[PDB]
Amino acid sequence: TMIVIFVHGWSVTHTNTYGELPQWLENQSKQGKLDIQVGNIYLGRYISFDDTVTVDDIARAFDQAVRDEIADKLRDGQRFACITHSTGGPIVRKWMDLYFKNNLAKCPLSHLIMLAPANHGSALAQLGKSRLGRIKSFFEGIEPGKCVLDWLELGSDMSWQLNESWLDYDCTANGVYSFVLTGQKIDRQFYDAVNSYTGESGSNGVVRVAATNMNYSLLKLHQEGDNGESLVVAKMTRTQPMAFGVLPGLSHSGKNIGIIRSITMANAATHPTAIWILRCLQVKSRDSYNKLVKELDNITKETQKNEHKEFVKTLVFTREYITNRYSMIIFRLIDDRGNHLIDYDLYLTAGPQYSEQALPAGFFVDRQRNLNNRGKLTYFLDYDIMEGGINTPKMQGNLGFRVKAYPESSDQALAYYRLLDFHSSKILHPNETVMVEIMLQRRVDRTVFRISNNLTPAKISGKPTGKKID
Amino acid sequence: AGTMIVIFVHGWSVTHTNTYGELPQWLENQSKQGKLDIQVGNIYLGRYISFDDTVTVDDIARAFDQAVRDEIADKLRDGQRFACITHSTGGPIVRKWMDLYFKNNLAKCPLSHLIMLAPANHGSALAQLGKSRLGRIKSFFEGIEPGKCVLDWLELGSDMSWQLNESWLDYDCTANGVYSFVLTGQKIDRQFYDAVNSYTGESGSNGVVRVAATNMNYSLLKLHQEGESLVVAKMTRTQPMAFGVLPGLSHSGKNIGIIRSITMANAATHPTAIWILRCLQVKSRDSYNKLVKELDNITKETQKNEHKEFVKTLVFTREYITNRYSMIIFRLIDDRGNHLIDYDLYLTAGPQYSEQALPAGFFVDRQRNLNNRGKLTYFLDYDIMEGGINTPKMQGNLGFRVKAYPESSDQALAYYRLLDFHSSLKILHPNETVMVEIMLQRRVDRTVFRISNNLTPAKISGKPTGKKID
Amino acid sequence: TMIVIFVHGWSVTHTNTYGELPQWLENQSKQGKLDIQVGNIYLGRYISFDDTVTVDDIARAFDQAVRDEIADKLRDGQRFACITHSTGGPIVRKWMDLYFKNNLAKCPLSHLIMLAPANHGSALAQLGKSRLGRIKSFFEGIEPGKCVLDWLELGSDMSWQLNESWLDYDCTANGVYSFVLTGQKIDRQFYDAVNSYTGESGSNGVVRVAATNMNYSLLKLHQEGGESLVVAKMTRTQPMAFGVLPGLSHSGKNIGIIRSITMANAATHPTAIWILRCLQVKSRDSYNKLVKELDNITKETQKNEHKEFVKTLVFTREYITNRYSMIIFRLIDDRGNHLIDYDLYLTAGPQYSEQAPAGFFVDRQRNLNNRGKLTYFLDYDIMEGGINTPKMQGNLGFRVKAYPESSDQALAYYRLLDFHSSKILHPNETVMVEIMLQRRVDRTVFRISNNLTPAKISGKPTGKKID
Amino acid sequence: AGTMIVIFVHGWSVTHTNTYGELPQWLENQSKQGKLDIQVGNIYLGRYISFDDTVTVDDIARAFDQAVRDEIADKLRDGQRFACITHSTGGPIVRKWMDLYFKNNLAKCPLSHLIMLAPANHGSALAQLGKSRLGRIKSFFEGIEPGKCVLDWLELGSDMSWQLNESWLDYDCTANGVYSFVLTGQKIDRQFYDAVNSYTGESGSNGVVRVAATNMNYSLLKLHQEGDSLVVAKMTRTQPMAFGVLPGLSHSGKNIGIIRSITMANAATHPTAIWILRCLQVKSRDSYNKLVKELDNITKETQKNEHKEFVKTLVFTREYITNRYSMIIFRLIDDRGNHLIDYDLYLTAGPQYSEQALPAGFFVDRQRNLNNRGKLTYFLDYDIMEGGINTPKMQGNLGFRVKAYPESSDQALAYYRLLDFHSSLADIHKILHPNETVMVEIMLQRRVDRTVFRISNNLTPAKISGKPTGKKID
Ligand SMILES: NC(=O)c1ccc[n+]([C@@H]2O[C@H](COP(=O)([O-])OP(=O)(O)OC[C@H]3O[C@@H](n4cnc5c(N)ncnc54)[C@H](O)[C@@H]3O)[C@@H](O)[C@H]2O)c1
Ligand SMILES: NC(=O)c1ccc[n+]([C@@H]2O[C@H](COP(=O)([O-])OP(=O)(O)OC[C@H]3O[C@@H](n4cnc5c(N)ncnc54)[C@H](O)[C@@H]3O)[C@@H](O)[C@H]2O)c1
Numbered sequence A: 001t002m003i004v005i006f007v008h009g010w011s012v013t014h015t016n017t018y019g020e021l022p023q024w025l026e027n028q029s030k031q032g033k034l035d036i037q038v039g040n041i042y043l044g045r046y047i048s049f050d051d052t053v054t055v056d057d058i059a060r061a062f063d064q065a066v067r068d069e070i071a072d073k074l075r076d077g078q079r080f081a082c083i084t085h086s087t088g089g090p091i092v093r094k095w096m097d098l099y100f101k102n103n104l105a106k107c108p109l110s111h112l113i114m115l116a117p118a119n120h121g122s123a124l125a126q127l128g129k130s131r132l133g134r135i136k137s138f139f140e141g142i143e144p145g146k147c148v149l150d151w152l153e154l155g156s157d158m159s160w161q162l163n164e165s166w167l168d169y170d171c172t173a174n175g176v177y178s179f180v181l182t183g184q185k186i187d188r189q190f191y192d193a194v195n196s197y198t199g200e201s202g203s204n205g206v207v208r209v210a211a212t213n214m215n216y217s218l219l220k221l222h223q224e225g226d227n228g229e230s231l232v233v234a235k236m237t238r239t240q241p242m243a244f245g246v247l248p249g250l251s252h253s254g255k256n257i258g259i260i261r262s263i264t265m266a267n268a269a270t271h272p273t274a275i276w277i278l279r280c281l282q283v284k285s286r287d288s289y290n291k292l293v294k295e296l297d298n299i300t301k302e303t304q305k306n307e308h309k310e311f312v313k314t315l316v317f318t319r320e321y322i323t324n325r326y327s328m329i330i331f332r333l334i335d336d337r338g339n340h341l342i343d344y345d346l347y348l349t350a351g352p353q354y355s356e357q358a359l360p361a362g363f364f365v366d367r368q369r370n371l372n373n374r375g376k377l378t379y380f381l382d383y384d385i386m387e388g389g390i391n392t393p394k395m396q397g398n399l400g401f402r403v404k405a406y407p408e409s410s411d412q413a414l415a416y417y418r419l420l421d422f423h424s425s426k427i428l429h430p431n432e433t434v435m436v437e438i439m440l441q442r443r444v445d446r447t448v449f450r451i452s453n454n455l456t457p458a459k460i461s462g463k464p465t466g467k468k469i470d
Numbered sequence B: 001a002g003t004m005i006v007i008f009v010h011g012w013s014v015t016h017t018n019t020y021g022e023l024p025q026w027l028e029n030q031s032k033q034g035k036l037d038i039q040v041g042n043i044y045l046g047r048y049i050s051f052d053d054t055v056t057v058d059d060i061a062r063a064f065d066q067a068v069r070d071e072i073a074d075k076l077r078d079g080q081r082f083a084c085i086t087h088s089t090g091g092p093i094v095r096k097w098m099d100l101y102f103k104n105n106l107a108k109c110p111l112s113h114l115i116m117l118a119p120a121n122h123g124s125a126l127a128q129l130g131k132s133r134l135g136r137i138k139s140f141f142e143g144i145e146p147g148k149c150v151l152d153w154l155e156l157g158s159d160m161s162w163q164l165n166e167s168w169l170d171y172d173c174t175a176n177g178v179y180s181f182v183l184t185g186q187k188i189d190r191q192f193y194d195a196v197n198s199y200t201g202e203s204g205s206n207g208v209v210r211v212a213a214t215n216m217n218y219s220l221l222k223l224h225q226e227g228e229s230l231v232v233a234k235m236t237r238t239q240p241m242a243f244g245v246l247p248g249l250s251h252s253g254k255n256i257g258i259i260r261s262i263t264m265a266n267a268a269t270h271p272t273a274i275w276i277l278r279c280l281q282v283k284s285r286d287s288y289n290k291l292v293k294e295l296d297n298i299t300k301e302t303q304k305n306e307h308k309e310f311v312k313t314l315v316f317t318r319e320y321i322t323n324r325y326s327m328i329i330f331r332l333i334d335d336r337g338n339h340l341i342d343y344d345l346y347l348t349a350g351p352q353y354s355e356q357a358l359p360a361g362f363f364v365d366r367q368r369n370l371n372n373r374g375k376l377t378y379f380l381d382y383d384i385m386e387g388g389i390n391t392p393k394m395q396g397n398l399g400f401r402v403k404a405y406p407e408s409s410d411q412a413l414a415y416y417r418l419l420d421f422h423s424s425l426k427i428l429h430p431n432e433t434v435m436v437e438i439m440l441q442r443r444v445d446r447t448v449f450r451i452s453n454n455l456t457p458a459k460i461s462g463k464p465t466g467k468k469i470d
Numbered sequence C: 001t002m003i004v005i006f007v008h009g010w011s012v013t014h015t016n017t018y019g020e021l022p023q024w025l026e027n028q029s030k031q032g033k034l035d036i037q038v039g040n041i042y043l044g045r046y047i048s049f050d051d052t053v054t055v056d057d058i059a060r061a062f063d064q065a066v067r068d069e070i071a072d073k074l075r076d077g078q079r080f081a082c083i084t085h086s087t088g089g090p091i092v093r094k095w096m097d098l099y100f101k102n103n104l105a106k107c108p109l110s111h112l113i114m115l116a117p118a119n120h121g122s123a124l125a126q127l128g129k130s131r132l133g134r135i136k137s138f139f140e141g142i143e144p145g146k147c148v149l150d151w152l153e154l155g156s157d158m159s160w161q162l163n164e165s166w167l168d169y170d171c172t173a174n175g176v177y178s179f180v181l182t183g184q185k186i187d188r189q190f191y192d193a194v195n196s197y198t199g200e201s202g203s204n205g206v207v208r209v210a211a212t213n214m215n216y217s218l219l220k221l222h223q224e225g226g227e228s229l230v231v232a233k234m235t236r237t238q239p240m241a242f243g244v245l246p247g248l249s250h251s252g253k254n255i256g257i258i259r260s261i262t263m264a265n266a267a268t269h270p271t272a273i274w275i276l277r278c279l280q281v282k283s284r285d286s287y288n289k290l291v292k293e294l295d296n297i298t299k300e301t302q303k304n305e306h307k308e309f310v311k312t313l314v315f316t317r318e319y320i321t322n323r324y325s326m327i328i329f330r331l332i333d334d335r336g337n338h339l340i341d342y343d344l345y346l347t348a349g350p351q352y353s354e355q356a357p358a359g360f361f362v363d364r365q366r367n368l369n370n371r372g373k374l375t376y377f378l379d380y381d382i383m384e385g386g387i388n389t390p391k392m393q394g395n396l397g398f399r400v401k402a403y404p405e406s407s408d409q410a411l412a413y414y415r416l417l418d419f420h421s422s423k424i425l426h427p428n429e430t431v432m433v434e435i436m437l438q439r440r441v442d443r444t445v446f447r448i449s450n451n452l453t454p455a456k457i458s459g460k461p462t463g464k465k466i467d
Numbered sequence D: 001a002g003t004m005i006v007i008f009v010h011g012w013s014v015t016h017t018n019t020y021g022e023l024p025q026w027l028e029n030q031s032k033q034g035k036l037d038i039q040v041g042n043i044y045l046g047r048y049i050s051f052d053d054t055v056t057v058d059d060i061a062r063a064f065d066q067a068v069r070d071e072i073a074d075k076l077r078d079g080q081r082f083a084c085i086t087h088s089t090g091g092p093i094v095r096k097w098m099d100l101y102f103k104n105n106l107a108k109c110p111l112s113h114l115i116m117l118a119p120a121n122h123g124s125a126l127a128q129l130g131k132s133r134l135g136r137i138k139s140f141f142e143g144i145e146p147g148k149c150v151l152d153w154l155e156l157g158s159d160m161s162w163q164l165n166e167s168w169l170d171y172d173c174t175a176n177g178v179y180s181f182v183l184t185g186q187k188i189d190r191q192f193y194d195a196v197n198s199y200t201g202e203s204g205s206n207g208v209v210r211v212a213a214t215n216m217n218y219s220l221l222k223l224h225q226e227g228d229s230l231v232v233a234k235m236t237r238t239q240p241m242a243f244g245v246l247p248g249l250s251h252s253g254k255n256i257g258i259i260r261s262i263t264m265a266n267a268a269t270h271p272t273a274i275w276i277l278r279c280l281q282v283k284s285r286d287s288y289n290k291l292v293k294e295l296d297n298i299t300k301e302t303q304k305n306e307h308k309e310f311v312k313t314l315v316f317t318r319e320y321i322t323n324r325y326s327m328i329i330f331r332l333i334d335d336r337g338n339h340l341i342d343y344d345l346y347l348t349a350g351p352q353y354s355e356q357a358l359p360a361g362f363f364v365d366r367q368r369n370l371n372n373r374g375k376l377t378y379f380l381d382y383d384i385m386e387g388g389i390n391t392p393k394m395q396g397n398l399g400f401r402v403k404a405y406p407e408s409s410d411q412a413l414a415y416y417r418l419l420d421f422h423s424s425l426a427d428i429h430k431i432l433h434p435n436e437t438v439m440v441e442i443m444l445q446r447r448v449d450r451t452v453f454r455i456s457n458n459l460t461p462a463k464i465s466g467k468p469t470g471k472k473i474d
């Protein structure tokens, strides 16, 4: 009654990317642990190395591939589970959005198990097609498709569109049980030295675990107050809870410790991914699901506690690597007129007074700005260093945002924005991404247009009246 | 329930209200003699900022609303309505202001008349030349360089002018007690022909804006591909509006500026002053109809007399041929929502429409928009087109052929197929622009995603099936 | 006692680009009309469709291929003749410049016959790699190397550099006999409706007649000086054989200048005819008589091809092809900078009015990598006809103004230059026009004062200039 | 029969001559007390335009010569020479001036002393930050946005910076009676730190210029790829110049600006006033060489006292570590004249020269020039590196590895070969010196395969194969 479909990631050119997990599940079903008839396990192959192919298209082609091989079985009423890796995750989420956003109860997918999904993007996607194809994790010279890489770029418009659309989902309430499994171990033998993201703390060498999590909040900040005063009003929303687990000592790819690539028949019984793939596949109820959620999070705590400090030693060097728990902000800033702000300055603030110079030492990990939509900003931060120094008596747990959009207020300004200030701290969570959309009031001065019945001609002064228009 | 207000609106790079010539002084006196009902002090000079890089057209239209309320909110509340006499970009400004504030209830927009002097309603070919290069041109000597965002508005094939004009397809000013008129000229002030820029003397233009781009009588043909490839044509058209081409008038200049060259002494004989007075005297649909025919007659008289111009000097003899012209603005997208940038576009003619059968001399110019490279503005010679195509061996045919890439090939995976629209005398009209939005069928090959239950790992072939997906 | 090597053009993937001319030169030699041993005819094949391969690469490679195959025969005192087509011409010209610039008496090349070389560039190159590859004749969809396009875009730095070096050449005096043979016929099937250059008058569909000629002048105008102003300096290459053959396009089996040559039509093919004559030249006299005969063929061809009437059951059209002139402008200043923002004017008439003949202009192009290189394409006949009249006194000049202009605030600017002359233009010829502007800096850019009381720094110009 | 003349020239962003603090009046009164021989009226305040986009550094140098000739022509004719005291970009400008008029006859240059305070001789990391972002920085609150041509010059690894400073390799200021000096500081004025641009508080700088960029004791390093892969290296170095890292001084600001904070009430105890007065008194090869010995001593003590700073407010406690750093400026060309832009560069250390063996914390910052993509400037911590490399297990080794593209592959036709260079932190002939910039020019051997051109006398037409021969052409 159960069908299983594997979906790989980008820059994949061989179906052994799935390791030996497919054979395992078929072999496990033969022993009564799964109800998968012979021939109901499918290996998915899709073309991710084409510059002309967008993400939507592959989601359209996935639909065509599903109806093609198993329309008869879906008519009988079987439903399938999705075990994806890397881009496969976002692809299937798009396919669901393209075909079942508002009738998920009638979607033929029964389970969706995502392995290290770049649900909120990969920092390396901005590196390009050629500079990143050189990294042996892809290899060829110029590997993955440009349009796939536009999607995965941090602060991507399409990424925001699909994830804000997914804010409304309720998979559990509709009989769809989704999960996310990821690791935070760097396969240090493949660290590209002149591309630090490959050994970034908080990642498996490719995707940051905070980008894997499907538990995230959208925070909308609207500027108000006429010419003073009131200013910012906040409204926050959150996805439905999803089973989230950071498993121990598993990187993104590679036979050695690849989250899926490292699965063999011999080690499947003790492979964290193999073990938990199955337990998720076994879910058939709401209580079973929620018991798996509270089990997975417990593991997440354990692995991130056990992988906090690492001492690797060669005959040449001695090194300690610190891996904490992290967070991610995707900032979008628009205005009340439809323009997308691209020129601005954004500050995190803290202290009794919400000063931009007060955040604890070491709060920052990385700042990236999207190439196509420049006005999108993705910050990568150390939640543990922050929360540690944030939550004290004389800092009071404060954290805020200050956007200085441009052009700024001046004695000659005619269309400009004002300083926006927000004071809070719950915005950030460990191993979580946050989407902050900040809407500013575009302020046009009355001088931009004036009328006077003084019919004696005169020069048109660019003299601002210092008074805004309604 | 009685009285008339008049508000003048100038054009771009205007820094002095003498841009309006002496037309305000004239109308005040004409109303004093009983030819209009305009109380003393109800004629207004508008002055807005067009030389600011930060100020948008939306900004100015919004600022116009505040300027109106700021000065004549009381009178409007008394049941008074104003007539906007606009010049150049002032027209696009006022149209945008009706769209922002009163589209779906024009019946009580405070505007009763809109007389539009030489407005780049469908853009100005000069805009793409740039800010610095244009400020140095003889058409811009009288002011400062133009705003970057204003220039983004008047660029041929611009998105904003497209958005505004498609919205104006649904307008109906006449039925709502709003009488709009467009008046322009087609004479080149040859003393201001920029040498290294032919647009400043382009036939069918007044040195700045093309006659066809001033007309508000335009169509929108949406051509959708279906499929053996098929095409479905659907066209709509604006409501009839008064349109006049007056004799021997340029865009600006004290010599023959359509409004700039109006003095107290020459107003009685000035074509602009005469017909502006007539237009303001309309208070009925029948009066509107009568003016429509009378104005069209002036267009045919004007374009008959100005067909040839003989310039002789002690140094050279020259003949200038100004005919009647047509304009297209092509938009090209696909059925998945993407906006296409790479395509080849053909006009067709003959028995079954060869791209090489067009009459010699059909072409005047084409321009590709800088921000949307998929927007194509063609400028053609309707006389020569119609003259050759409406013959027995030509059978009065015309069509479009679009070749968008990636094209069909063994490289397929993702591509488009040719479109052939087969039509016409109608698509073209003299002194008229037409918007041709063509929706393509994006085809995806099935190997873009396939699933197979053969658990034996294998390489992933990028070879298309030759069969598209749904 | 002679070797022949064929060199092809860009986007060529098959040796048949040379038509059947190679077998024709082997048979003509066997009949006693040339002294070529059997096996001394060579087909050169170089890669032009690789984005990473440069013209410098291909030249360096030509030398290695020559040495790899005929080092034996070259030391035995044989020397070879190169018959080039399209970009193959510039390639040999570059090789020539890499290994035998200072001593053409020791170069193994004895003859160079160039078939429609875009020696001064091709207007098509700017169209891009993708757009050009879609032209059915060369069809593929993205084809030629981008570095090849960089060399062959009008006004490119490299072709400019190679050809400035060529004002110092004199192949004939060094025993080397050079030739340019081209046509001006449009193969009208290959006309691309979205790219009008494909039928441009004054071209063979790809190369303009004035772009293949090696008879050009490099005119240098140095603005000196409140006033005083212009100084002119013109240098010109040594004479070369230039022939415009009848009824031949760039490529295609129908009327390709070399591609349409067959075993059966070679005797009447204008190319095969004059290729044999060019190879038979062996002295100053043979070269000079050949030169003038090509001049007669050029005037005969261009007089018969002035008007062409094409006929179809759907339309009847008339094609007028005149003789055209190309100017290539280079604009720098007395400091080494390359000027990008400026307006350029042709001026004519008694007062040299930039506003003064109708139809003078055909095309203008701005190079994509060097923004300051401006290429004119002009109708010489219409030009000469309108200016060499009583009321226009045959005058022709330039005017340039680089930005910043002299302004109320300008501190680093340029002064208008005005050249008066006319010989700059000749039909079927390109002229390279380098203009050195005088960069003027106002003193306010730097002042010193012993008034030690601090004060704000005003940037208002003093109205004076620094040395 | 003369006295000396002194001319101040400021840096970029300067709209007011108070940028020089009160140093000029101090030098006037100090001369009045017999400590200098400056006649009244022989001290000049220079003002050049740094905020105009149309104005290049070459135009500033040109204008300086005209200004000097406009004001003190007959003074210089009568046998007088002037001392230059510069701050920020004024340093390079004068250096550009000397190069335009006296490159190879410094014995005939009217300048007798050059005292540069915070010259971005090798550029400022802030220059890459466009002239719009940079005018928003609170430091130059009083100043307006730069001219773009000054930025292009100040940008790290700019071609024009490489040219002037490469021409300065053959200078010998001391041997021609010209006494030049570099006196900088490394204090961060923590009050004006722009939190959106961390360079403004970068360790190893004063807020604008890194200590490695000020110094004129630098080396040019050439690595020529040879073989039929072997490397041949040629190192060249400038003549010793006075170098001083003075204590507790930032770039600008009346609080602790190296020159902006100078008043007459604090001049007697201002390190910059003390040492400038000493430089101006140099009148021999002897006094000069012993003045640089003194500056080396102060440079040392300054960086030992400023290694650790602790700022304590009621809200937070912080500790800032500042060590000694070195700047590598990479230029990459090939033997054909082309400029290699696409490549990757690995510093390698330890036995067997592994890229993955560099000492932890070796790196501070990397920047790729905007106008010339082939220029790579690395900013490195010398102490952490020298500490980790000059140990038994590391054998004191440091090398370079550049790959260059296209690389060796089945593509081939025109490609490049791996360059492996080995040497350094030995203290005998090392490549990195503390508080120093090093210039590294990398020439790769462009390799073309024989398939790019073949000839054959088999006259039967055939398809042309782009299949690489795997063998190269000379
Ligand atoms: N590359 C990474 O792994 C990484 C790490 C941290 C942050 N980021 C951030 O991602 C964004 C893009 O990364 P980026 O590397 O292009 O920015 P960058 O500032 O680090 O480098 C800019 C350019 O210089 C190149 N370059 C840097 N070091 C080089 C070296 N040793 N050899 C050859 N080329 C070298 C880079 O490839 C890039 O083209 C930036 O915001 C950056 O701060 C990237
Ligand atoms: N800006 C600095 O102080 C700094 C510090 C260290 C290294 N660098 C290096 O200098 C080079 C260029 O500097 P960069 O800052 O442009 O590179 P970057 O990678 O840090 O940022 C790239 C773009 O994102 C913008 N941006 C980043 N954070 C922002 C924020 N909070 N608010 C508004 N805009 C923000 C930046 O202005 C920039 O346009 C890079 O190689 C970079 O790695 C810069």
Ligand SMILES: NC(=O)c1ccc[n+]([C@@H]2O[C@H](COP(=O)([O-])OP(=O)(O)OC[C@H]3O[C@@H](n4cnc5c(N)ncnc54)[C@H](O)[C@@H]3O)[C@@H](O)[C@H]2O)c1
Binding pocket: A186, A187, A188, A189, A190, A191, A192, A193, A194, A195, A196, A199, D345, D346, D347, D348, D354, D355, D356, D357, D358, D359, D360, D361, D362, D363, D366
């Ligand atoms: N195998 C791994 O997992 C791993 C992880 C981190 C660092 N390392 C290695 O440890 C050593 C110390 O690095 P770190 O942790 O102090 O800082 P880092 O590795 O985070 O590097 C900091 C910056 O310098 C770049 N860089 C790193 N190594 C380089 C090299 N050999 N050559 C040129 N650029 C390089 C990086 O891309 C980054 O921009 C490096 O050799 C580094 O390659 C290895």
